């Protein structure tokens, strides 16, 4: 996150860090004691070397580490250039016991809409500057949902955002999620309800003509319930 703020430690106990050989790769959201929801493009990796770490604030710190038994990418995931259905569910090799630092975030209703104007925020350990390095501490950034039609403007995303995608903007031009931030949850409203999983931007994180986009959670809730086996 570029231009964001350090969170209060463990104030977002659903946060997962997906890591390869101890190195952070993407965020995730714990959506069940045995399942982390994250971005599918994050799993273009040798799974043998991937771990999920829970309850972290500071990135170099133990937290609680899980091996991954299975990585189930959405059936209709299409990678770049079309980054469609950019979601994967990861099965932990143990079962999370809810505590103060680690806890699942509930899925929204399957009929949640994320309307233009909705005030949200997201969290991650991603880059703090263009071409920089990961954040040492978990950070957060307020984001507002933009009208998808305006985001699809020729100078912006040029018709390529589907109805399942949530177009986002910070309050300032110099604030944006950046590399390492995908997979992490977008929570919206006063009740801080899970509404999206961050996906993509353009190569430059703060490019105002390429606002960040998250995959909306609500249209995938029934898939998620089928996969997790919890109707």
């Amino acid at each position: 996150i570029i231009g964001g703020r350090e969170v209060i430690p463990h104030s977002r106990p659903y946060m997962a860090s997906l890591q390869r050989n101890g190195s952070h790769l993407c965020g995730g959201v714990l959506v069940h004691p045995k399942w982390v929801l994250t971005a599918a493009h994050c799993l273009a990796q040798r799974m043998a070397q991937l771990r999920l770490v829970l309850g972290l604030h500071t990135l170099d710190s133990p937290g609680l580490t899980f091996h991954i038994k299975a990585a189930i990418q959405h059936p209709r995931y299409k990678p770049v250039p079309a980054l469609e259905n950019d979601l994967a569910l990861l099965q932990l090799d143990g079962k999370v016991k809810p505590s103060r630092t680690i806890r699942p975030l509930a899925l929204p209703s399957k009929r949640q809409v994320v309307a233009a104007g909705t005030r949200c925020s997201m969290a991650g350990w991603g880059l703090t500057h263009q071409g920089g390095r990961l954040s040492r501490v978990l950070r957060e950034l307020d984001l507002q949902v933009l009208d998808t039609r305006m985001c699809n403007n020729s100078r912006f995303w040029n018709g390529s955002l589907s109805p399942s995608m949530v177009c986002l903007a910070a309050d300032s031009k110099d604030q944006a999620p950046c590399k390492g931030d995908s997979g992490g949850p977008l929570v919206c409203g006063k009740g801080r309800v899970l509404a999206g999983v961050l996906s993509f931007s353009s190569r430059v994180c703060t490019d105002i003509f390429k606002p960040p986009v998250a995959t909306a959670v609500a249209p995938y809730v029934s898939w998620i319930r089928k996969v997790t086996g919890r109707s």
Partner: peptide
Amino acid sequence: SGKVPL
């Protein structure tokens, strides 16, 4: 053009 995964 260019979607770049975050």
